[PDB]
Design a protein around this ligand. Sequence first.
Ligand SMILES: [Mg+2]
Ligand SMILES: [Mg+2]
Ligand SMILES: [Mg+2]
Ligand SMILES: [Mg+2]
Ligand SMILES: [Mn+2]
Ligand SMILES: [Mn+2]
Ligand SMILES: [Mn+2]
Ligand SMILES: [Mn+2]
Ligand SMILES: [Mn+2]
Ligand SMILES: [Mn+2]
Ligand SMILES: [Mn+2]
Ligand SMILES: [Mn+2]
Ligand code: NA
Ligand code: NA
Ligand code: NA
Ligand code: NA
Ligand code: NA
Ligand code: NA
Ligand code: NA
Ligand code: NA
Lengths: 387, 387, 387, 387
Amino acid sequence: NYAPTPVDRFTFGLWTVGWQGRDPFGDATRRALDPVESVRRLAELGAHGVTFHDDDLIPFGSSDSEREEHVKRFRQALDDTGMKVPMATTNLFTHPVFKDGGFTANDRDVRRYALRKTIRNIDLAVELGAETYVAWGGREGAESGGAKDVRDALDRMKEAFDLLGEYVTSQGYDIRFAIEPKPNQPRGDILLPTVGHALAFIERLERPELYGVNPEVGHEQMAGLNFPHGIAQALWAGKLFHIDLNGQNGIKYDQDLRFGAGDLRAAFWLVDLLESAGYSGPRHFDFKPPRTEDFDGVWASAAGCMRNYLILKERAAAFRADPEVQEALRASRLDELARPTAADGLQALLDDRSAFEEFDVDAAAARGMAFERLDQLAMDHLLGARG
Amino acid sequence: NYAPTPVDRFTFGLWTVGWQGRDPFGDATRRALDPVESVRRLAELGAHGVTFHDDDLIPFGSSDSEREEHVKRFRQALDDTGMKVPMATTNLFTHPVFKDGGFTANDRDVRRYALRKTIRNIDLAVELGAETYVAWGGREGAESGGAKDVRDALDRMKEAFDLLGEYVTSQGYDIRFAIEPKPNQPRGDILLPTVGHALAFIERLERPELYGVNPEVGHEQMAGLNFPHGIAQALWAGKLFHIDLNGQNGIKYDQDLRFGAGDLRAAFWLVDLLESAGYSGPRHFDFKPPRTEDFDGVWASAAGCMRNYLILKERAAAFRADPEVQEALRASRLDELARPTAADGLQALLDDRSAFEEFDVDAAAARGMAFERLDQLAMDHLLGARG
Amino acid sequence: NYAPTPVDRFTFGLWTVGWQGRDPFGDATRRALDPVESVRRLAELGAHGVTFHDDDLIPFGSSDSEREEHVKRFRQALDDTGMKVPMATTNLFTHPVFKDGGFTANDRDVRRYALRKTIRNIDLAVELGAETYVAWGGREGAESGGAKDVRDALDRMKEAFDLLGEYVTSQGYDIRFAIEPKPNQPRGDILLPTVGHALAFIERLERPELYGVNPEVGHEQMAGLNFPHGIAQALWAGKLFHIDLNGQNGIKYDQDLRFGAGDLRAAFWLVDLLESAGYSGPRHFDFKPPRTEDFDGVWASAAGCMRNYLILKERAAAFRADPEVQEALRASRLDELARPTAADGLQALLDDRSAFEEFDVDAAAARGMAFERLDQLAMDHLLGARG
Amino acid sequence: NYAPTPVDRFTFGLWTVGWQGRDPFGDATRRALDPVESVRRLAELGAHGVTFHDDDLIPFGSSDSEREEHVKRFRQALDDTGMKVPMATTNLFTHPVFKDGGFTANDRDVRRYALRKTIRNIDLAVELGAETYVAWGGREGAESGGAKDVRDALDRMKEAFDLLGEYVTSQGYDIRFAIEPKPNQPRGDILLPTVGHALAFIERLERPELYGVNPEVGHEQMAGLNFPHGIAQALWAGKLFHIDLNGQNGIKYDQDLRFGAGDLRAAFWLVDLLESAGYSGPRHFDFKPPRTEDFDGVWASAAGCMRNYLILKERAAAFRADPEVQEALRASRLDELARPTAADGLQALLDDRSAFEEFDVDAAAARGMAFERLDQLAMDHLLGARG
Ligand SMILES: [Mg+2]
Ligand SMILES: [Mg+2]
Ligand SMILES: [Mg+2]
Ligand SMILES: [Mg+2]
Ligand SMILES: [Mn+2]
Ligand SMILES: [Mn+2]
Ligand SMILES: [Mn+2]
Ligand SMILES: [Mn+2]
Ligand SMILES: [Mn+2]
Ligand SMILES: [Mn+2]
Ligand SMILES: [Mn+2]
Ligand SMILES: [Mn+2]
Ligand code: NA
Ligand code: NA
Ligand code: NA
Ligand code: NA
Ligand code: NA
Ligand code: NA
Ligand code: NA
Ligand code: NA
């Protein structure tokens, strides 16, 4: 039961199942995986595709001949399995040169290098068929207040993204960008810390249509925010170009638990929203099998990501299709929420005594919302406990 | 020392010093204050002005004659003291009718009433000379996932703000709106939970120039965010129309401590930013003297808000003026952060071997940022411990 | 399905279903309930009993004749329904006199009064058959560092609890005390902020056997802690005298959502632990139907507390009984965790070359824990998705 | 000004200034330091001593001859500088063998090895003159609920600490143990997550007098707790055997900022408490110079730890010595908090009409606490802004 299919579009970063287990306090617990083995094992589990940072696929500093051979082997694995590459990204965080940032490093020479490293990988992403190019600016930020003038840093961040937009336009590429917010870690505070900040920033770019967000479940939860609500705002803005699925237990370091772990009810409401809205992008997992696990546990954890999505999809669909739930939604006036407040227009609203002088506030206030009954129907559906 | 002056533009809500001390677990500890007494006492402390919700100035449900008398008494107090009213707002949260929201209530009749209540108070705000009309949507949100379709709620929130913009335009008013984010409390999650989300929303309004943000120190800190960074993004966007100053100890219920309490170093960096950027708006305190205090403690707490701002202003100015700090800022390449990455343009960047093939990444990575020395100069200046 | 029974021992505070909906920003949305009506309605839902603060049952300041009549009516309702009163507590937080604390108020006269108020209610609790007397010191703490010397306050808190122990001993009462931790709210920081701090404090009382903890799900989660882990430590110490069940979404104000809401997987692991350990005390709900609800929603929310406990009980029992889970627990060495490290004794351990010189650390480190497979079996059982 | 002296007893872990800068997302930015160089550089800054994990001083897996040479070189550096070694600890977290724990690993063979590794290092610690042996169980815990039975794990943790106590007793050593709590990171939840939980656990050990706590500023703040309050409870219990000083910005990953950074006012109240209580132990820094820094920044950051302690010590002493503050403390009844509630005894309290029938609750409730004036005197003293 709960078998993944190609139409599910489940994807994984090479760095997810390939995470060797090094953490702030501990050495690697697993050997490095050849990307070819990850492609083949993920395909066997029913994944649709993989994603990569440049430096996951091509060791940093590789010669041109080494680069070609790494890509050739990877493409053979994709061809052997039918796996796709819908998204790629740049590693602008691991190498010590990026310790104060890539695009917003105080040192101008580093900012220029970061752009050149990204541009090289955009070309490769296009060659591999990627539709989306993610940017997670994990080093953009500060540990202290004097170190980073945020207005200047936003100027540099806009300059960088504008140059990348000029680049893809000039090459005729169809790829689009997706900015991934995170509030903190590894910097004390990261620039563009939430979906909202990233959405607002995009509106000030020269070609805003080329940029959206890549929100990650656990990152919004590191600020204690409601991930489904943030996804709704991204959808409302037309900017949900990609998504990273995982789990997180609240306000901690970025745990990258398998999807469904962490906040299970938020996972349910997320799946309900994505499916109801018709989100058509990859269901991408940015997760880490815990370092306690051997390779069998790596593949179990990856399989669990997909399984949990599919269980939640079934339960959310059953919730929305249940005539008792539909009745409860009407009892709670969800239908009215979807209707304009004043399609009659401002003057009619100003002239409407039913909106002011003749509005019976106490009668209105007496009406219960019936939200608890609705939420218990939702709980019963999630748990398969209807009756 | 540290005496407030009119040019400081310190303002207070009537509801701040007037908070009677009722909390989720406790009855009022102080009697209600007549707004006239608050105006006179705040003036004696050196405040510039006050602000109000409709229902702070005019008891809810007042007749027209009662409304006129309350306003007349208040205006006499303003005239007697020279106090100004730079900002007003609507109470769309206390009355039970607003239990599921004002502008985004599921019930359409409530949404219409909320608009009419706001419009009435915009007229009064203009009469009193207010330049800014704040909206804190404290009831917009949910405790459960099925209760509130966030895309529909954002449609209703946009409709409401668009109608208010149409209203002020039609009346020729110069007032502008400032949306106040908060992540949670009293709703389990509040819509537009951070500065970023509010900035992004504004960009989708029909007349975006009429709307900015009113960020509150403690509200961003309830999401664990960096308040100075968020203020920098608002300034970068041209949207810092007003600000609420207070203190908060991290991820808790909204404490509304006096300004300078809570995160003291964030208060220092905030003042540094506002002063360096030339912010010209009110320095408004949205705070609550703790319910442990009698009226002498109320006025001490209000005086402390202003005193702490003035101490921090002195220390931040001394930091920025110190030639040793200026040298440290250059050592940390803050000057380079402010210079364009690639004013030479995309093609020149692509052709520049110094940005890629000839970039010595290891030499760059060896350079220290010297951020710790800079931050200890900042600490020494804050504490008055230079030497 | 999932029908409560007397053996389930589900109990509710009068103040839970009776919460009128006043919050930091909003007036009451529901009328006050007569305790008699709450007793009868809860009995109809299948509850076992109720609990009370003194001032929930007897209005503060009541005359002796008024007190007698309130108690008489309440006892008739208990007799009419078969409901029990297993626990009572004192309100040492609502009245303004308690603004700096009860037992740890700086003012000595208030500390003495707080003790007398508690002692009066202990007598009543015993009369009504209560086995446990809870103390939640919600006003014990501070908003500022100079206001409360914590060593002195702990001396006063110990003195108070020691006097209460002397009192019950002197009267021959069998009741025991349960201290309820909370980290913050309504005070900026509350003394004894977690289960651990309360357990440690108890060990320093003169008669430690008379005192245990009353942990509340949401309170530990307000510190981001693992509630099942804290309950395990309380059980390990022999100190889980009572428990408060509810839901919470992380590090926020105390939400008091119905049990099962908030962190659903933590609710599952909690029920698993209580049932596996054979906890025999009340399953008490300290929750608040949201103020959006009318009385039908109050009773729906209360019914949901019990329903969710019963669903989770079924799923946890099925998890533990499943031979595949039992195999997975052995694969993950849970059996070995339960066996002594060195029952052979210190000298044998020191002499055992297999524990040091001949321990193959790399072979040991290669063994996977298989925790992800185990956790996905747990997820499948919770969701009723085995297969 | 603010020059460290030997009587200040400032100490640093080898792993602090020696941290190479590897984080969850980034490679090392600094070369490894020889412990000899750290000893000499710290001595030049005015430190009193250093501390070590076994594997900081002796590379893991070293032969006996290699071990002797590493220790000999280190002792020469201590002799050359006058530096002391007041504390040592075991690394039971870095090596992959410890991925599920040391003392509470599910695998019994690992638990035995962890004990043998610790015992070997206790012998070395004693040889170097250490008075305290710290244990930070960073791997004790879980990412999932089924992986770790917490009651069984506490049994194993008690067994381990009891064996270590038997060991030191049998050898006649004067060293004592200090357990370091942390709430999470690197495990999803860590056992003994706060000062309170550790204090409670100690009370159940066979020889409780041999064990205390080693609280760390940032670790308690990762649970949003008040670090000065927790230190007060440890002092009250007689269990503050050692302390780790650093800074943290709230509920995040463990930042290990230099002391004084993070929550500056909490640092002030901490120093006030340690000095007022006469804490006589090391002022030990467990911090990390940010990876942005070169070695000059490492030493600047270390110097800043000590400087900030000394500034805060001066300001707290001035606060306590100021006759205006002493008057304010009496106005706020801090003197009364320190006096017994009922030295007259239980019967006298029960018979005292002034404690109940004749207690004027409204007159008592009208008295203000004057806490805001007191706190603004504290702020003025911290900032050197008295006047
Ligand atoms: Mg619709
Ligand atoms: Mg500039
Ligand atoms: Mg057992
Ligand atoms: Mg004393
Ligand atoms: Mn992540
Ligand atoms: Mn991601
Ligand atoms: Mn606030
Ligand atoms: Mn505000
Ligand atoms: Mn609660
Ligand atoms: Mn409770
Ligand atoms: Mn730490
Ligand atoms: Mn430490
Ligand atoms: Na700039
Ligand atoms: Na979209
Ligand atoms: Na709509
Ligand atoms: Na602006
Ligand atoms: Na005392
Ligand atoms: Na127990
Ligand atoms: Na055991
Ligand atoms: Na002590």
